[PDB]
Amino acid sequence: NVASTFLQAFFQLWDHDRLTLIPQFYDSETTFSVVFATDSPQDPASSSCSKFSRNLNILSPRHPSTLQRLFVGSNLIADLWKVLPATRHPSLDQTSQWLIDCHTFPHLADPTGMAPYAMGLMINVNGQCEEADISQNLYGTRTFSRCFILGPSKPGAPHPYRVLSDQLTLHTWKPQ
């Protein structure tokens, strides 16, 4: 199971050494997205994304009830990831915590040009984690859904597969 192998490594790194993930799996073609709500009072990630978008003037005003999405190109991924809260994810060994779906996506082009089509992998992850922001002194449990789109990597890549798209949706944050 490639998804389990990828997610086990991905989330362990995401907790302790996330920036390592970018050179390994991410490239110039990749896009990263975060969906969050402005309404939440004690949400650390929402404030982090909100401040980040404002600083780079990326933010576009919407109704408070309306959901907000922040998407960044390859150059901005590292800086955005830095700002996001520290997280501790439960091991995938605990089946109750994670719901993982892995599906083939045979619509991708072949970078080599050797074959007409290239095999693509789509990974959807439902999980929970412990989000802590020390500077704010905010601690809580997060509910999230994350979607990965995997395709064949470009030449000189560390790994055979790369992340074409990464979409993170922040649903609920429970204090203490």
Residue numbers in the entry: 381 to 556
Sentences from the paper on this structure:
An unexpected homodimeric form of ctMex67 was also observed in which the two copies of ctMex67NTF2L formed a dimer analogous to that in S. cerevisiae NTF2. Two copies of the LRR domain were also present in the asymmetric unit, but the LRR-NTF2L linker was disordered. However, the previously ordered pre-α1 loop that gave rise to the asymmetry in the NTF2L–Mtr2 region was now disordered, perhaps thereby allowing the symmetric homodimeric Mex67 to be generated. Moreover, ctMex67LRR-NTF2L appeared to form a homodimer in solution, and in size-exclusion chromatography coupled with multi-angle light scattering the protein migrated as a single peak with a molecular mass of 82 g mol−1, consistent with a dimer (each chain has a theoretical mass of 42 g mol−1). The homodimeric complex of NTF2L domains in the ctMex67LRR-NTF2L crystals was unanticipated because it had been thought that complex formation between Mex67 and Mtr2 was a prerequisite for efficient nuclear export of mRNA. Although SEC-MALS indicated that ctMex67LRR-NTF2L is homodimeric in solution, whether Mex67 is ever not complexed to Mtr2 in vivo is currently unclear and whether the configuration observed simply represents an inactive form of the Mex67–Mtr2 complex or whether homodimeric Mex67 has another role in the cell has yet to be established.
